[PDB]
JSON list of C-alpha atoms in Angstrom, two decimals:
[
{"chain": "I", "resi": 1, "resn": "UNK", "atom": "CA", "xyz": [122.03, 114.42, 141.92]},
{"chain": "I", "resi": 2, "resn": "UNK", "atom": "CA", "xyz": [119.65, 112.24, 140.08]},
{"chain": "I", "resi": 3, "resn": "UNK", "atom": "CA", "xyz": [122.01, 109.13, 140.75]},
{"chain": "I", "resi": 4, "resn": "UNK", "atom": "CA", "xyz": [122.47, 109.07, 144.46]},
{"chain": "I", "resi": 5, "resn": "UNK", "atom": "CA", "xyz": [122.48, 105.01, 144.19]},
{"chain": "I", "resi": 6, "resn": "UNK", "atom": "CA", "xyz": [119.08, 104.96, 145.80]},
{"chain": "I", "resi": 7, "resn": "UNK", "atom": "CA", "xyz": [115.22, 103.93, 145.68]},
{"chain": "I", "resi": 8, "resn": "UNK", "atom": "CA", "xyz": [115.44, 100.66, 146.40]},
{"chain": "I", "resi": 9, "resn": "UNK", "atom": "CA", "xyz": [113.00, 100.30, 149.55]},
{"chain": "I", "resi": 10, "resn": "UNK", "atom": "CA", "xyz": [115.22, 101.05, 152.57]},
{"chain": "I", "resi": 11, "resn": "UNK", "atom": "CA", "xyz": [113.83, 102.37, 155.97]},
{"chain": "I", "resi": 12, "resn": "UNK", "atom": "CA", "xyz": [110.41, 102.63, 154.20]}
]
């Protein structure tokens, strides 16, 4: 959902 542990500048 709106968690998903993510953001954080991966592959981007």
């Amino acid at each position: 959902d709106e968690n998903l542990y993510e953001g954080l500048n991966l592959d981007d």
